[PDB]
Design a protein around this ligand. Structure first.
Ligand SMILES: NC(=O)c1ccccc1NC(=O)c1cc2cc([N+](=O)[O-])ccc2s1
Ligand SMILES: [Ca+2]
Length: 839
């Protein structure tokens, strides 16, 4: 427990600690660290004159004390090299010699403190020395593992030396697959446990009922952000994206779903459901059947269709698969999709802010810049270096790193039945640079598809796979509004709606002279003029924005309703936009204002599901409205949210019904991960700081409020990114009992970190937005919706615990943290007793 200095400093009556007070030491939970400073009784002012300590005369403990005589020697050699004392001390040095060396070092340290009138240089120098000792750096945290940040440490549930960090929970890996602690026997598509607990930074223990209640509190805050912050009911987020589903306790999915039902009534009818359409980012193939059984309170991605698009269209030519998966490899087999309501709702995409963007930057970095890059922990310089290669590759016909056939992918996504398409910002605008400043070469094609989707895309779907010539094509037909089956004759609006997409994925595609591609348009489209919407050209894609813009290319269906194409129409191409073939055709003569979308019904839902993949849901479009690699704004007019408010008419014109905004939390700046480098909003210290204490990357809190209001002014719903997995860069240190683990929480054998003291950054200020809003709504929520707090959650068997409000985050609310490079012995012991110092 408890004086420190004795037979290692021959100055001890002057250098010993001022008093036996805690305020004399820079401690962490009354423990001492290698970097701790303290107030001695006297300071050898200017290295000359012993003076009494001036209450603000703190000095490094390593100036006067050392854990071992080996460490004293290392310190002496290091500080000699730092202070211009050309004299090292070798393995045989005696204690007397080291003490006199340390006294000389102290004298010249105090001389330099007076000379520079600052002690910063000495903070830096002592830190740098400390990081040379294997017990105080990564060497004792090794071996590294496939954790994204090389390793993690799990806080012990019962630590006698740190009882304030104890917990009865920290139940790990309770993914949807593994929510009960055993693999769910219902779901067999993913043989694994369907995720893992430790992803990034400080891992929130979402098995803690108090933390669960605080996650509900935060969810309520986001869904009432307008009301709460700006006292404006038109500035609320309408929906959520559930982040990192496979790395958090799946109880949150019930908590969120219950809330959406209790507070917004999404289970009552489709109008309520589609007004708060919320999504998961859940990567396991079990998560979609799990979510369907849970009640379709949210929708997951169609990962199968995403993979089908990626490998059939986007991959390099020699790595490209056959085309038939595009029809059959997706939640919905689109061979003949004639259902009024699909079995399972989903959203579909080809790229996201992370998926197939930062992966490509990593590919580029590992291939031409830094082959040792760890996960996605890029440096800004690596990113800007990789972006020149990336941007040059985007424009090439032969691409080594970037996607082929973007427009073909979007032609399928934006005409497919039975899924909500999600358009990625970085496929219409550049992934880097200022928001909406520079269009991609595919902007025109994608915009044309969005507007044509509003005007033409409705009805049943038919997909066909035809072997022609040396290769293959696929056709995708939508029959038109009101025609679910090919035999439906339709009315006047059916006649002028529907669409045909013809695609190939092989630039060598050549049809035989005798080859015919017979595309059945449906019984509403006999003897009808059709005109192109999109056509592949030698250099790219020609888009047609009107019936007159295509006057000369009209063709006709026969009396059986079939368009027929020959080698004269279809062949392979190879240009920056197409590797294969794209043709999109629409019927001639749709009124300029034709709109085949349908609004959600208010009729009562009766199947026990909240979200239904019907024509009303199919009429929606999701827009992921940000890029990880957006440039930082240079002026207020370039702020993301300001631009969004100014350009909301464009999103209305594209049919965007759901704007998925970037997470709006003020980013941390530690740079320990991609998110902490480009500051997208996923690395944060304050869950409630939505540009309040300082602008986020996208503007001020007021800019956010105005962007939400502008989006609502067009009937567009807005989605908040709910990120309960982790938090970064806490400002206050804490001492925990910790064990080195893999990303599943399994202890690493032979690690010196095994039920030992470790210094984390895991306490928030207590003076931030969390301190203001934390738990502030739990009384309102329990009053309105008592059944939310009556539910016995699956992973824990007990309800949420709102009896405690989290005003300051602390290690007891976290599973653990990524390894911090502080070592296994950062907390100082008395060498004789082998006991940790506690003041
Ligand atoms: N870094 C993240 O955004 C993240 C977030 C939550 C959970 C895991 C994450 N990791 C991934 O992005 C992965 C993609 C895939 C894709 C598949 N699959 O297609 O089957 C399987 C495993 C992974 S992990
Ligand atoms: Ca986690």
């Amino acid at each position: 427990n408890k004086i420190v200095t004795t037979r290692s400093n021959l100055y001890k009556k002057y250098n010993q600690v001022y008093d036996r007070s805690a305020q004399s030491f820079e401690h962490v939970d009354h423990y001492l660290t290698a970097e701790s400073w303290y107030r001695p009784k006297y300071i050898l002012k200017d290295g000359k004159t012993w003076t009494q300590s001036t209450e603000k005369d703190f000095r490094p403990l390593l100036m006067t004390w050392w854990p071992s005589q080996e460490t004293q020697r290392q310190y002496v050699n290091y500080m000699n090299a730092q202070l211009g004392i050309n004299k090292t001390y070798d393995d045989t040095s005696n204690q007397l010699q080291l003490n006199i060396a340390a006294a000389t070092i102290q004298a010249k340290i105090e001389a330099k403190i007076t000379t520079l009138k600052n002690t910063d240089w000495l903070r830096q120098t002592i830190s740098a020395f400390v990081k040379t000792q294997s017990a105080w750096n990564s060497d004792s945290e090794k071996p590294f593992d496939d954790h994204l940040q090389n390793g993690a440490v799990l806080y012990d549930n019962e630590g006698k030396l740190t009882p304030y960090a104890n917990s009865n929970y920290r139940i790990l890996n309770r993914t949807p697959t593994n929510q009960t602690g055993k693999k769910d026997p219902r779901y067999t598509a993913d043989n694994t446990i369907g995720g893992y607990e430790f992803l990034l930074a400080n891992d929130v223990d979402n098995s803690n009922p108090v933390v669960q209640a605080e996650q509900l509190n935060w969810l309520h805050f986001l869904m009432n952000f307008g009301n709460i912050y700006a006292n404006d009911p038109d500035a609320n987020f309408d929906s959520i994206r559930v982040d990192a589903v496979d790395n958090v306790d799946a109880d949150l999915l019930q908590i969120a779903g219950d809330y959406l039902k209790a507070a917004k009534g999404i289970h009552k009818n489709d109008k309520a459901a589609n007004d708060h359409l919320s999504i998961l980012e859940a990567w396991s193939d079990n998560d979609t059947p799990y979510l369907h059984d849970d009640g379709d309170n949210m929708i997951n991605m169609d990962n199968k269709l995403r993979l089908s698009l990626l490998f059939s269209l986007a991959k390099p030519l020699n790595q490209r698969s056959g085309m038939n998966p595009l029809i059959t490899n997706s939640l919905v087999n689109r061979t003949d999709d004639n259902a009024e309501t699909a079995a399972v709702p989903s959203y579909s995409f080809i790229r996201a802010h992370d998926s197939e963007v930062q992966d490509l930057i990593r590919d580029i970095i590992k291939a031409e810049i830094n082959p040792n890059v760890v996960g996605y922990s890029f440096t800004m310089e690596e990113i800007k270096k990789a972006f020149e290669i990336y941007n040059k590759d985007l424009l090439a016909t032969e691409k080594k790193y970037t996607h082929y056939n973007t427009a073909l992918s979007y032609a399928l996504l934006l005409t497919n039945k039975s899924s909500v398409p999600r358009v990625y910002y970085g496929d219409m605008f550049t992934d880097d640079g200022q928001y909406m400043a520079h269009k991609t070469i595919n902007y025109e094609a994608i915009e044309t598809l969005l507007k044509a989707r509003i005007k033409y895309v409705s009805g049943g779907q038919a997909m066909r796979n035809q072997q022609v010539g040396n290769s293959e094509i696929i056709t995708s037909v939508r029959y038109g509004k009101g025609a679910l089956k090919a035999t439906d004759t339709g009315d006047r609006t059916t006649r002028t709606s529907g669409v045909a997409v013809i695609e190939g994925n092989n630039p060598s595609l050549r049809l035989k002279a005798s080859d015919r591609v017979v595309v059945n348009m449906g019984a509403a489209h006999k003897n009808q003029a059709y005109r192109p919407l999109l056509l592949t050209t030698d250099n790219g894609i020609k888009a047609y924005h009107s019936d007159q813009e295509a006057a000369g290319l009209v063709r006709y269906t026969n009396d059986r309703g079939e368009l027929i194409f020959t080698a004269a129409d279809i062949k392979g191409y190879a240009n920056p936009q197409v590797s294969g073939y794209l043709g999109v055709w629409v019927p001639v003569g749709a009124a300029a204002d034709q709109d085949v979308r349908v609004a959600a019904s208010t009729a009562p839902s009766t199947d026990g599901k909240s979200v239904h993949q019907n024509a009303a849901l199919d009429s929606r479009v999701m827009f992921e409205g940000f890029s990880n690699f957006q440039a930082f704004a240079t002026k207020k007019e370039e702020y993301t949210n300001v631009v969004i408010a100014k350009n909301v008419d464009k999103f209305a014109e594209w049919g965007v019904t759901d704007f998925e905004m970037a997470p709006q939390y003020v980013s941390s700046t530690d740079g320990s991960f991609l998110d902490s480098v480009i500051q997208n909003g996923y690395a944060f210290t304050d869950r409630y700081d939505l540009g309040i204490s300082k602008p986020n990357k996208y503007g001020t809190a007021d800019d956010l409020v105005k962007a939400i209001k502008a989006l609502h002014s067009k009937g567009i719903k807005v989605m908040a990114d709910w990120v309960p997995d982790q938090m970064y860069a806490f400002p206050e240190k804490e001492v925990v009992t910790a064990t080195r683990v893999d990303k599943f929480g399994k202890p690493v054998e032979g690690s010196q970190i095994k039920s030992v003291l470790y210094v984390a950054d895991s306490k928030s200020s207590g003076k931030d937005q969390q301190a203001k809003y934390g738990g502030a709504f739990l009384e309102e929520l329990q009053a309105k919706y008592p059944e939310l707090f009556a539910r016995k959650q699956i992973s824990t068997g007990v309800p949420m615990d709102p009896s405690v409000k989290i005003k300051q985050w602390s290690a007891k609310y976290f599973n653990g943290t990524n390894i911090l490079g502080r070592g296994a012995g950062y907390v100082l012991k008395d060498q004789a007793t082998n006991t940790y110092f506690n003041i």
